[PDB]
C-alpha cells in the first residue's frame, strides 16, 4: 500500500530511507536513471525499468539517460549512430510502459557550462577515489586509460544538470553515487537494485556474456535458455531461476504436480517458494518448467508491442 | 647567423634538428608558446619571449597562449577576472617587441569540438604517461587529483587546435610535448628553452618564491636583489648572475677595475667571462655590479614603455 515500501520493494540499498521520506513530502520530485545503449535488452534492464515505473506511479517525474558518449569512453562501441541503437532502446522502454524524458548524453555533455563543472569536479576528486568507483563498471585495462577517471566525474556532474532528487541504478553504481553524494551541493538519494546472476551462474547477467534472456527472444528460446540454466537443488543464493522467481513473478501461482508425489502446489509467496526449494521439496526441472511459462506470458505483451 | 643558428641560440634541446630545417623551408609557418598569466613578469618570461622574437624574425607567425583556465586547474588562483591581469601581460610582451595573436584558453578550451577531442585523446593516453609528464609541473599534492591527469591532454589538444608547426616551451614541458609527438597526427617540432635558477640559487625563478627580477622592478631594487644573490666564486652552474650574463647581456663588455689588479678588462664572449670566474680572476662583487648595470640598461626601454 504505502508508497515507501512499494518503492523499497526489491531494492538492495536505499541511501537513505529517512532522506527519501523527507523528499516524498515534496510536491514535485524527479527520479533519474541512465543506461548505456545495448543491442539486446535483457532482464537486468527490466528490473530497473520496473522500479522507475514504481517511482513514476508514486508521483515522480522520470528522466532516463542514454549514455551514447560512454560507448566511446568505455570502448563499448566505436559506432557513430549508436543513437539508432538507443532509439530502439528508448522504444523498448516505452513498450514496457514508461513514458519518461529520454535525454541523450551527446546533447548535454559537450556544453561549455557542463564541461566547465567537469573540470571543477576534477579539482575535488582524487585519482584513488575515481578508480575505486570504476572497479565494477570499467574494463580494468592492463594499461589503464585516462578515460577511466573521466567517466565518474561526468557521471556525477550529469546528476547535477539533471537535478534529480532520486538517482537510481544498479549496485554497480554504488561508489560513483557515494562520490556524488560527497561532492555535489544537493544530496540526492540513491536507490540501488540487485545485480542479476546470469543463466551461466558464473558471472553477472550481461548481453555481451551471452548468459542473458531477452524480452525480444522467442518463446522457444526462453524455454531452451532456462532448460540449460544453472539451477542446483537446495540452492537459493546464486540461483538465477530463483532470482527470476523473486522479482519478475506474480503470486499466487500454481505449480503442476501429480498427487502421487505431492499434488498441485499453489504458492502465495516467494518465501514459501524459497522454503520449498531450499529443503528440496521442489525439483529444479519442475521449477524451470514453471518459471519459464510465466516469463513467456509476462514478456509476451512487450514482445507484440514491438 | 643563418636563421637556424639564430633560433638554436640559447636553446637546450630542439626536437628535431633536421625537422626544424624543413619547417623553415616552408614559406608559410607558425610557432606557438603558452603562458599561465602571472602578476609580475620576471626574467624567466623574458627569455621565452626573446626566442619567439627570434622565431618571429625568421618569419614564424607567433601565437601566445594564456592559460586562464589552468589558473583553477592547477589552483594557481581562484580569482575570476584573471583576464585583466593577463591583459597587462599582453602589453608587457609587446614592449619587449612581440606582436602576436594572443589566444585566451577559456575562449576555446570549452568548445564542443575541442572537448570531444579531449575525451578521444583520453582514450589513447594511459594514466602512467600523463602522471610522468606532470612531474616537473605538478603541485606535489599528497593525494593527487584527477585534474592533474587532465592537464597534459588539454595542452596536447590545444597544440592540435592551434596547428603551430613549432611548439616551444620550457624544459619542464618536455614530456607533454613528447606526448603530442606520439599522439597528434602532425608531428610538431619542439624547442625547449633552459630553466633559469633563482636568485636564492636553491630553487628556480618563480613569481611565488620571490627570487625573481621583474622587468618592472625599480633600478635600485635590481642592484639590491642582485647584491643578495647566490654568486659562488668559481661556480658557473646554478649561478643565477652567471645565467643572466649567458642569455641576456651583450658582448663585448669592459669591466671596470683599477690597474693594480689587472685594469679594465675587455670580455668579448660569455665563454671568456665563464673562463675568468672558474679561474678566480673575477670577484663576485665586480661581476654582480657589472651584470646589474648592464641589466638595467637592457630593461630600460621595456620599463619606460610601461610607465604612463
Ligand atoms: N553508468 C551507466 C551509464 C550512465 C551514464 C551516464 C549517466 O548519467 C546520466 C544520469 C545520471 C543520473 C540520473 C539521471 C541521468 N540521466 O541523464 O537521465 C547515467 C548512467 C551504466 O553503466 O550503464
Ligand atoms: N604550461 C605553461 C602554460 C601553458 C598552457 C597551455 C599551453 O597550451 C596552449 C598552446 C601550446 C602550444 C602552442 C600554442 C598554444 N596555444 O593554445 O596558444 C601551453 C603552455 C606553464 O606551465 O607556464
Numbering used by the authors:
A (entry chain A): 1 to 306
B (entry chain B): 1 to 308
Authors' account:
Genetically encoded caged amino acids can be used to control the dynamics of protein activities and cellular localization in response to external cues. In the present study, we revealed the structural basis for the recognition of O-(2-nitrobenzyl)-L-tyrosine (oNBTyr) by its specific variant of Methanocaldococcus jannaschii tyrosyl-tRNA synthetase (oNBTyrRS), and then demonstrated its potential availability for time-resolved X-ray crystallography. In contrast, the genetic encoding of caged amino acids offers a more facile and robust approach for biosynthesizing the photoresponsive proteins. These synthetic amino acids are recognized by specific variants of aminoacyl-tRNA synthetase and attach to tRNA, which in turn translates codons (mostly the UAG stop codon) assigned to the amino acids. Thus, cell-free protein synthesis of caged proteins with oNBTyr could facilitate time-resolved structural analysis of proteins, including medically important membrane proteins.
